[PDB]
Amino acid sequence: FNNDPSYNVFLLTTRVGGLGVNLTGANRVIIYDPDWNPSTDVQARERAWRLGQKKDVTIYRLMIAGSIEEKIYHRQIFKQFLTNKILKDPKQ
DNA sequence: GGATTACACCCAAGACACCAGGCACGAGACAGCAAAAAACAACGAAAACGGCCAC
């Protein structure tokens, strides 16, 4: 994927992929389905947002409004707050 | 002294309670064609993917 001008897109199923695979070639990212682990998505974004990435990277989240996606996304935001007030400011 | 005067002794009619057995209740305990056959609803779910080791 990195060393070929063709082979533009490829699906990854971000459970198996994210162990540290180097995919700096990517610049755009599409998230299709929200996951349960709030962590599995940071490695997913890091599949194109490696340290010192060559070009700007963007994330497009898919979210079905008025569905379980709403509950999961709010849950993930709450989980981010959990690790973002325990380690940032316990007054939040 | 001995019999009227009185009082003790007991015994017979009496009663209440006793002893049991009836009598009614009281609720269990039933207990209710056989043979043949067919329809006929209900008895009734661990997802899915990865990182492996051993093929």
TrEMBL record:
<protein>
    <submittedName>
        <fullName>DNA repair protein</fullName>
    </submittedName>
</protein>
<comment type="similarity">
    <text>Belongs to the SNF2/RAD54 helicase family.</text>
</comment>
